[PDB]
Amino acid sequence: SSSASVKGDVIYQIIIDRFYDGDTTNNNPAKSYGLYDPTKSKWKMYWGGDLEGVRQKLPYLKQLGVTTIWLSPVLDNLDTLAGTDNTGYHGYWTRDFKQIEEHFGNWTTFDTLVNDAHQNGIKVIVDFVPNHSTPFKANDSTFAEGGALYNNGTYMGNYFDDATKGYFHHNGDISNWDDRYEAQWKNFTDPAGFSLADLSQENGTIAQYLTDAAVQLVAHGADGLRIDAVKHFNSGFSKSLADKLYQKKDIFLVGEWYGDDPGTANHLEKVRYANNSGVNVLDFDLNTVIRNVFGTFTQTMYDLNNMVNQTGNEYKYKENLITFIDNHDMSRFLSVNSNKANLHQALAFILTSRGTPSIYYGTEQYMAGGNDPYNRGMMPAFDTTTTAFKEVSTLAGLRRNNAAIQYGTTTQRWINNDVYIYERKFFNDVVLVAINRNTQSSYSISGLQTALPNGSYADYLSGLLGGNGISVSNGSVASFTLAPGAVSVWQYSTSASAPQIGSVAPNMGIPGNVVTIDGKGFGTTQGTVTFGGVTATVKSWTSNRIEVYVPNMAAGLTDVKVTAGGVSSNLYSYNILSGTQTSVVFTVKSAPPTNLGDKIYLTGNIPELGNWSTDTSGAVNNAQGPLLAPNYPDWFYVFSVPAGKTIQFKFFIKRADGTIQWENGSNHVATTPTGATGNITVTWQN
Numbered sequence: 001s002s003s004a005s006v007k008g009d010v011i012y013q014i015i016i017d018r019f020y021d022g023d024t025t026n027n028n029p030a031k032s033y034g035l036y037d038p039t040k041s042k043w044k045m046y047w048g049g050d051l052e053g054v055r056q057k058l059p060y061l062k063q064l065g066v067t068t069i070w071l072s073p074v075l076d077n078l079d080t081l082a083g084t085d086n087t088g089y090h091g092y093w094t095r096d097f098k099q100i101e102e103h104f105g106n107w108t109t110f111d112t113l114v115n116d117a118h119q120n121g122i123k124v125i126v127d128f129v130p131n132h133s134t135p136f137k138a139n140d141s142t143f144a145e146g147g148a149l150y151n152n153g154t155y156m157g158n159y160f161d162d163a164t165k166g167y168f169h170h171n172g173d174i175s176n177w178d179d180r181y182e183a184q185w186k187n188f189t190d191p192a193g194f195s196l197a198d199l200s201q202e203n204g205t206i207a208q209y210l211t212d213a214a215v216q217l218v219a220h221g222a223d224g225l226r227i228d229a230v231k232h233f234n235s236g237f238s239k240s241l242a243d244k245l246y247q248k249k250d251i252f253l254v255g256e257w258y259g260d261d262p263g264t265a266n267h268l269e270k271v272r273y274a275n276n277s278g279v280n281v282l283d284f285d286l287n288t289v290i291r292n293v294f295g296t297f298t299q300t301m302y303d304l305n306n307m308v309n310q311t312g313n314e315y316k317y318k319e320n321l322i323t324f325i326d327n328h329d330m331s332r333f334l335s336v337n338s339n340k341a342n343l344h345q346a347l348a349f350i351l352t353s354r355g356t357p358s359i360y361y362g363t364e365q366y367m368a369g370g371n372d373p374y375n376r377g378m379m380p381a382f383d384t385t386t387t388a389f390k391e392v393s394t395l396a397g398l399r400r401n402n403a404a405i406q407y408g409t410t411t412q413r414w415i416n417n418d419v420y421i422y423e424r425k426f427f428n429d430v431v432l433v434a435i436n437r438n439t440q441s442s443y444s445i446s447g448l449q450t451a452l453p454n455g456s457y458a459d460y461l462s463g464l465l466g467g468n469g470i471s472v473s474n475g476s477v478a479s480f481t482l483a484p485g486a487v488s489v490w491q492y493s494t495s496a497s498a499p500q501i502g503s504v505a506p507n508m509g510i511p512g513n514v515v516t517i518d519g520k521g522f523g524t525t526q527g528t529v530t531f532g533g534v535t536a537t538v539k540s541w542t543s544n545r546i547e548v549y550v551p552n553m554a555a556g557l558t559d560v561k562v563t564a565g566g567v568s569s570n571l572y573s574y575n576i577l578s579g580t581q582t583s584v585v586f587t588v589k590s591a592p593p594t595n596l597g598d599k600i601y602l603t604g605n606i607p608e609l610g611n612w613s614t615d616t617s618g619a620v621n622n623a624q625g626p627l628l629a630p631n632y633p634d635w636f637y638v639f640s641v642p643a644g645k646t647i648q649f650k651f652f653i654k655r656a657d658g659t660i661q662w663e664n665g666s667n668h669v670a671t672t673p674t675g676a677t678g679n680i681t682v683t684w685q686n
């Protein structure tokens, strides 16, 4: 379906309470009375925006070029205050994952918005928050709701009556946010003075409950999810949850793994997550550099090009990275740099670069505001004539119609501290983009080379951002002047004469799942699709999109190939799992003494456990880990493995110097759980 890939889309991120109040009758419901501020002066109270308000503004969003709305969390949040004028208006403090937040509407309202968005050719992804319930104080159960969790109105439990249930972790507050055990098993804290009750995704009831809630959003039409705080709950559950969701529909998943930029201690773990979990990630690596190049001017175009190259080398599916200049957890771009030309440049960069851009609501209306909560002001106007509105609409159309933006390579063609001219190319489709961040200097551009075919090209933006026309002859662009602060875009597109795969999505699944191949040159007459040479049953076939069912074949990463008119396409990988997954805590007791830098990994006889690999790089299906060791000399971590299967595995130490020390003896043998979760505990064999 069109849900699988968002490569041709523009994502628009909406903080529901702050966008549009389409129904004033749900502003202050009796269920959660007293959390509404009609004056819009108490920044952490509900201001009244809702799901019906988003639906009423569909015409505006369509005209802007939005093709996927990312809705902030829609499920029932805390019904009380959490300290002075502080509420769950933002949606991240969930008390009931089965019900829509009453300030925003009900399930009918959600269904109506999603149905009307789809009628307007717009998809809806929902922000889903599995890490925690709501604010609590460990020493006082009367604060807020004490972390209470309900199942469609039926009480389940809170932080205080959990002794015999184990729905929450009880390990104290996070202190070191970079320590991986603390970040995942300790409580998320808020500087106001409270913690968020940390759900135990290793508890079978909670794992199935969260799975059911996510599946319910997809049953109601959602085209995918933005999964909150994926660095804060085990990554086995991310992969197992993604499995369940892809069995339901070929939706799109992206996870928020905040920060951990290149060169940092936890960076490789984030890259491995993006490459193996089945969940793509928000592009924080590029975000940092975008803000320093166009915002603070502390980095240059060389740094921006370097980060495009670095992310291009590390992320297997870099075209699934979701890019952004700002968001609801950082100051708005215009508060970093009030120059609107620099904002237009940053927007053009993400609109034409690899991956899919997410534009924070109101950027195009020139909203400004410092960090949370001042970056969550009310959408001020719906003016369709702003320069930014026009720019986004125009470039969104280019991204929908030119395959180079969706799937292309990226090649630097001209660079200095202020100017970046880069080229996207997908077979015969080419887009050359020039960006000059300096708003006071023009640059003479000579020696520019290109893959564009011969001819004269007008700026695709029609000079909106100071662009100019160019003349191309035999790969050379005639010398021209790039105006101060300008953005100029030159493009070429044509029909394909052979099958060209731009995307296969989702990137993981089991036999029988629907998978979508997006590209060009497939023809109108049905041809064939193979996975590792195995013919797949075709669900639908068009010139640019093929839907297939994953064949009942052996598990592992395999290559998808389209054959049309006897000619075969380029190959695109897809990870076939060994069956429906379960998320299992693997513990190895009494391992050998280790030194700083030494880490233990798990490996075994199925692709989920790396097929006996000892490789620990960003590759797909290699050794699993590393394990953590809060209970040293015992080590543990949580992994997604096929449910109800007998597996063989061993652990190994990867010393700081790269040396490998295997457990001795015979392989450990175990049968995995049939439910959502379970535990496999063994003793290290010396």
Ligand SMILES: C[C@H]1O[C@H](O[C@H]2[C@H](O)[C@@H](O)[C@@H](O[C@H]3[C@H](O)[C@@H](O)[C@H](O)O[C@@H]3CO)O[C@@H]2CO)[C@H](O)[C@@H](O)[C@@H]1N[C@H]1O[C@H](CO)[C@@H](O[C@H]2O[C@H](CO)[C@@H](O[C@H]3O[C@H](CO)[C@@H](O)[C@H](O)[C@H]3O)[C@H](O)[C@H]2O)[C@H](O)[C@H]1O
Pocket: 090, 092, 093, 129, 177, 188, 189, 190, 191, 196, 228, 229, 230, 231, 232, 256, 258, 259, 260, 261, 288, 328, 329, 372, 373
């Ligand atoms: C908000 C965000 O917090 C975490 O992110 C931290 C990250 O893990 C750290 O590494 C570090 O980031 C570095 C980064 O690595 C560097 O590359 C970069 O250069 O510098 C960064 C800044 O030093 O610090 C960030 C925090 O700045 C976490 O990992 C993220 O998942 C998280 N975002 C998402 O999670 C939540 C929770 O569901 C949402 O927040 C909601 O709940 C919060 C707590 O009640 C409310 O915010 C309060 O608490 C925050 C955390 O202590 C405070 O930062 C914030 O000022 C305060 O208002 C928040 O209003 C509410 O929305 C996020 O919206 C969601 O996107």
Ligand SMILES: OC[C@H]1O[C@H](O[C@H]2[C@H](O)[C@@H](O)[C@@H](O)O[C@@H]2CO)[C@H](O)[C@@H](O)[C@@H]1O
Pocket: 412, 413, 414, 415, 416, 446, 447, 448, 449
């Ligand atoms: O001519 C090919 C050459 O073009 C670009 O080099 C630019 C350079 O980026 C500018 O800073 C300035 O010095 O002009 C040069 C062109 O004369 C590419 O960046 C470079 O890779 C390529 O070889």
Ligand SMILES: OC[C@H]1O[C@H](O[C@H]2[C@H](O)[C@@H](O)[C@@H](O)O[C@@H]2CO)[C@H](O)[C@@H](O)[C@@H]1O
Pocket: 612, 650, 662, 663, 664, 665, 667
């Ligand atoms: O390479 C496949 C092989 O991997 C594992 O064998 C380990 C063995 O466990 C270690 O003790 C040491 O000898 O290195 C071997 C890898 O070269 C599995 O145990 C084995 O079943 C599997 O075939």
Ligand SMILES: [Ca+2]
Pocket: 021, 022, 023, 024, 025, 026, 027, 048, 049, 050, 103
């Ligand atoms: Ca309302």
Ligand SMILES: [Ca+2]
Pocket: 032, 076, 077, 078, 079, 101, 102, 103
């Ligand atoms: Ca509520």
Ligand SMILES: [Ca+2]
Pocket: 131, 183, 184, 185, 186, 198, 199, 232, 233, 234
């Ligand atoms: Ca957690």
